[PDB]
């Protein structure tokens, strides 16, 4: 009985949409904290070293800036269908 | 502290920052894994274009994390390598 398929409802869709929205927020928080770490290294070692790490970090940030809107889009799509069920 | 004035960070400080990047890479992988579980849990209840819509959007999110995670891992690994190099002139003389 424990393994029964949980049937889709608007409540389930909104719950999972929430998971995606929350994941987007956590991801943003993470990149903010890591940026702080890279900022903290400025002036603490050779400029060539800082340039390499800043460059890598900006590449990671660009990947994150693609990722977050995709998660938000999934959340929106789930909510759109949830509203259909309710209406 | 380093013999060289230009180096204002200790090996242990670099290792700490490297730990933040490693933790972040782990957390990102755990996140995409749990979201994958969610998509997988719904997939069999969708059909046609709707099923494909969610599957494809999720694949796109997974691809973005496949860019992101190795960059963070690389930063962590490289910070630790530099820590090892700086150690030779840290509190040495």
């Amino acid at each position: 009985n424990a393994m029964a398929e949980i049937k889709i409802t608007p409540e389930e869709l909104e719950r999972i949409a929430g998971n995606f929205k929350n994941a987007a927020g956590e991801a943003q928080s993470q990149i903010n904290r890591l940026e702080g770490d890279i900022n903290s290294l400025e002036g603490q070692w050779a400029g060539a070293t800082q340039a390499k790490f800043r460059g890598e970090f900006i590449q990671s940030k660009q990947a994150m800036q693609q990722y977050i809107p995709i998660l938000e889009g999934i959340s929106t799509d789930l909510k759109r269908i949830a509203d259909k069920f309710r209406n």
Side-chain angles (χ1 to χ4, degrees), chain A:
Chain A
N1 285 328
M3 288 304 181
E5 175 178 271
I6 305 300
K7 298 182 188 185
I8 286 180
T9 63
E11 293 89 351
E12 292 292 1
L13 297 180
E14 290 166 346
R15 177 181 65 84
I16 296 172
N19 295 348
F20 278 82
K21 211 96 278 182
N22 290 343
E26 291 177 351
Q28 182 75 72
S29 177
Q30 177 181 282
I31 199 67
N32 292 347
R33 290 193 307 272
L34 296 175
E35 185 156 21
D37 279 345
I38 299 297
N39 288 342
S40 76
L41 290 164
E42 169 65 19
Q44 297 278 278
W45 55 5
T49 306
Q50 183 66 12
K52 182 178 187 284
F53 283 91
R54 174 69 70 185
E56 285 156 355
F57 179 70
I58 289 177
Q59 285 169 325
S60 84
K61 187 176 182 181
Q62 279 154 348
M64 188 55 90
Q65 289 173 345
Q66 323 264 348
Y67 177 73
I68 291 168
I70 298 163
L71 299 194
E72 292 164 315
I74 292 169
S75 176
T76 293
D77 293 338
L78 291 168
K79 173 57 169 162
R80 289 163 71 197
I81 298 167
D83 286 344
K84 285 261 191 168
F85 292 162
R86 303 180 165 287
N87 273 301

